Amino acid sequence: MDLLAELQWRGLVNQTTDEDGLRKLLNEERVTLYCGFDPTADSLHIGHLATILTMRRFQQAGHRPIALVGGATGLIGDPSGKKSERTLNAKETVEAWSARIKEQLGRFLDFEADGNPAKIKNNYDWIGPLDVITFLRDVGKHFSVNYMMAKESVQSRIETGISFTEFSYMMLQAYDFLRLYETEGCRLQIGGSDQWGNITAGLELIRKTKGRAFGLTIPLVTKADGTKFGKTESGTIWLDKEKTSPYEFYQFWINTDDRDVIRYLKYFTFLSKEEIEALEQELREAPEKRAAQKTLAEEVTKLVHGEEALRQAIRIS
Amino acid sequence: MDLLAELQWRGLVNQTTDEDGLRKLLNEERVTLYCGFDPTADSLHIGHLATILTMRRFQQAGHRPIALVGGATGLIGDPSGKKSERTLNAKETVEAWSARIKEQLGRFLDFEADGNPAKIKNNYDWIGPLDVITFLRDVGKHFSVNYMMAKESVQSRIETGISFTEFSYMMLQAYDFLRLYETEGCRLQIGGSDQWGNITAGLELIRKTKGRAFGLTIPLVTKADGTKFGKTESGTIWLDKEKTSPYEFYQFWINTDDRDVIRYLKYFTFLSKEEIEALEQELREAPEKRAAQKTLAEEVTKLVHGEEALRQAIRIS
Ligand SMILES: Nc1ncnc2c1ncn2[C@@H]1O[C@H](COP(=O)([O-])OC[C@@H](N)Cc2ccc(O)cc2)[C@@H](O)[C@H]1O
Ligand SMILES: Nc1ncnc2c1ncn2[C@@H]1O[C@H](COP(=O)([O-])OC[C@@H](N)Cc2ccc(O)cc2)[C@@H](O)[C@H]1O
Predict the structure, then answer these.
(1) Is the CB of B194 under 6 A from ligand 2?
(2) Which residue of A has its CA nearest to B169?
(3) Residue located nearest, by CA, to atom 21 of ligand 1
(4) Were B165 and a residue from A53, A140, A188, B52 both cysteine, which residue would form a disulfide, CB within 3.0 to 4.6 Å?
(5) Contact across the interface for B164 and A154, Cβ inside 8 Å
(6) Which effect does the record note for changing residue 230 to A (chains A, B)?
(7) By C-alpha distance, which of A271, B163, A306, A282 is closest to A314?
(8) B7 C-alpha to center of ligand 1: Å?
(9) Out of 3.40.50.620, 3.40.50.10280, 2.30.30.90, 3.40.50.2300, which CATH number does the structure's domain A1-220 have?
(10) Which class would CATH give A221-316?
């Protein structure tokens, strides 16, 4: 209803399976949603914050988030939004990394709330031990090759080339949504733009096994200059303060271009509309002041790292 | 060398991966070959005898056959030579059926020979317990979707439609050839016409994992009238004497059309060339006698059922 309008307004809704459908339910019930995380590194990064912060926002309007760590799938590899086939990582690496991601994840969610506290889960627990035969019959039977072949993630790669391994990724992710629906009452799966195919894939698995649930994608982060967001010359801007220091984190935000700043405040912060509009007026009336740029930077650094870190960054700058 | 020439002559060689390559090895070593059987019913049928009898022939020239029972794959379903998607059978049914097939299989092979006795094996033993993750990474990584999509079995079905389940069948079969190569020194996989794709699939898995082995397909059984061999008005001609009695079996063969008879003697019998040519002359000189028709029928009934059964059929007719 209004949470969906806010998101809309903030510009956090790229697509939704059935908006009137979802808006209805969001307003009538406490909705369990998940979002999936693949240990693709030893740290999450600012590409992951929109989705992370969106969960929070869903939590704050009283809904319950399951941060999902991908111990099994990050063992497979999601072709989505990748032009090339990736390298398969070792179980040990993935295992190692899973533990960290779980840690960064837990900072953004509320585990003490009563009625809607998070859960952080690992699909390795239900993927780990499912036998091949069972997967192909139980899950595979439900998907035609041609449904699968039409996915943006796949269609985008067939001449490029794609391992059968990567080709089946969507099936796992598919399966995830089903276990979470069955065991946790999970009705919404949200994600970034590139994840739409894998979300619907899960809705196709649910419909076909039960015959109820939604999908919402967040747009990928835009730049007015047409360059790739978060891609600095120094390299990725991590969430691990040992990977990217609080000062560096801080400075990244402080260097937001006038063109981006109101979009980023909307995406990454908890300032109200009334506050954001106010900053918009000051960016117009006094853009050398850099009022919106400091508010963004303070707000986000506090979120990720906390006041002391913030206090340090500011004092260091 | 000469075994391959014989087969050639008999007309049992539709295709071979590398004939000079295989001919060489067949003449220089004791070759381990397998042939795969899917419990698709509670009995094998005369569609299966060419392949079965071919193994025997390979055994007789001193080679070692592994009759393979498909407890796992017949749980999946091979699209090959099927225009439509099949129904998935119960584990229990497949399990039940596996036991019978193993029994009919064992009749055609020599288990007492020293140096080249058969083995009857079940891919359920190595497929049964392989986890999904392991399969997609260990086996899937090696095959592009586009290699797979070009297979006769698959390409022949995409508009028709094909479950991902059936789409992956070739991967299992793929895997089979690899375990058998690794654990049994198996270098040749033979099969019927429709199996070429799945054979090569296994050679692609071997090359790519090791960097040696061959594939030979037997033609599907021809009729001069253009109808489907073994398809009677009474229904399938089984190998189970409780499904098709010895008399019925016998009569089926005895009703061979003049057009087929020399081809069938070549395919299903152990008569020499000199003998087959002799019968060819008598079919020419005296075709009302039905000399080739009785020799076929006697020879084959003895093979499948034994003399007493034969004696009965003849006395019953
Ligand atoms: N700039 C950005 N803007 C917005 N979102 C961004 C950006 N960068 C990354 N993301 C997102 O952050 C999440 C990270 O997912 P992933 O590791 O990349 O794979 C995703 C999935 N395969 C993991 C998964 C595994 C199992 C499962 O059940 C569900 C999901 C995704 O929703 C992705 O859309
Ligand atoms: N008229 C006929 N002429 C000649 N051959 C015929 C005829 N009718 C049936 N066959 C053959 O007999 C064998 C029976 O195999 P299948 O049950 O039908 O599936 C075949 C495979 N999916 C089973 C398998 C499973 C696992 C594995 O590793 C290998 C193979 C095959 O080689 C097939 O080609």
Answers:
(1) yes
(2) A136
(3) A36
(4) A140
(5) no
(6) No effect on the binding affinity between tRNA(Tyr) and TyrRS-Tyr-AMP complex
(7) A306
(8) 58
(9) 3.40.50.620
(10) mainly alpha
